[PDB]
Design a protein around this ligand. Sequence first.
Ligand SMILES: CC1(C)[C@@H]2CC[C@@]1(C)[C@@H](NC(=O)[C@@H](CC1CCCCC1)NC(=O)N[C@@H](CCCCN)C(=O)O)C2
Ligand SMILES: [Zn+2]
Ligand SMILES: [Zn+2]
Ligand SMILES: [Zn+2]
Length: 305
Amino acid sequence: GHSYEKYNNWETIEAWTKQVTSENPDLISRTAIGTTFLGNNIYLLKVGKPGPNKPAIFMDCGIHAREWISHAFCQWFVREAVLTYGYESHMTEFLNKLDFYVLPVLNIDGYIYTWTKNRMWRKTRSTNAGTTCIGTDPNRNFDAGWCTTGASTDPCDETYCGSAAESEKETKALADFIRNNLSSIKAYLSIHSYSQHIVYPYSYDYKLPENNAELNNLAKAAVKELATLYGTKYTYGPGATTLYLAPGGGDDWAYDQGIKYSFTFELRDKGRYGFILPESQIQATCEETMLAIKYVTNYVLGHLY
Ligand SMILES: CC1(C)[C@@H]2CC[C@@]1(C)[C@@H](NC(=O)[C@@H](CC1CCCCC1)NC(=O)N[C@@H](CCCCN)C(=O)O)C2
Ligand SMILES: [Zn+2]
Ligand SMILES: [Zn+2]
Ligand SMILES: [Zn+2]
């Protein structure tokens, strides 16, 4: 049984991707962009009112297995889109003018593993040569300053970069999709947890992006919009500058492909519950995050390129 106010297992999320598409055929279409290491279909939802030459926003959740609130947020975004389209001015305009490529769970194998064996699992579930240690960090596997300082060369480590850039089927599937739809994608959004932080490029090196001033102002305003609902405090800035060196990230790779609006959203909380954020907080966390996501969407729509 699926619920937007509860954490749902992969079988429930997969069934939901099929049901939400069939219940809303004029707003949602579903495709499989590839398969995981264990052979699970990587589903992608195209959310928006169909039309010609439409710009798009790409959003992924569940790159990291244990970050259950991120998987919950992608489902909440789709929930909001189908519930408020035709009922709220902004969401109506967004779905008419833009398409949202929502990837509810990127690291499906890791997500199944958090439900079955280890709640605190982070990486993929792929095998590594010369060791029994499992998985690669997908957010250290993209081809953007790949496997430099901030990523580990050790397969037993949580930040393992992989055997090569895009060695993971999941990373290659996401990268292939963006490369194939690059002319349409205007924004990249990666949903994670926890720290209450909005990251923008660069994370693979200590360097500021070309549009640093613009991204600083946009993140500042998105953080401000998020706080209006419950007073939740978010920090923001370039990845390497305000968080840590994290090379081979999807956001930096997307930015270097020409997607100048690229953000990583680290959701609730600040360490009290960490990855084990209670189900009672899903509603509040998702509703406030919606305000930041809608602010960025509105900005992108007013600054098309
Ligand atoms: C020691 C670690 C394994 C190492 C640093 C903290 C960890 C716990 C882990 N990081 C994590 O598990 C989480 C949450 C941590 C909670 C405690 C404070 C620090 C964050 N952050 C994360 O994956 N960020 C993304 C940010 C991406 C931005 C650019 N793409 C990433 O690293 O991929 C990574
Ligand atoms: Zn993460
Ligand atoms: Zn709502
Ligand atoms: Zn402007």
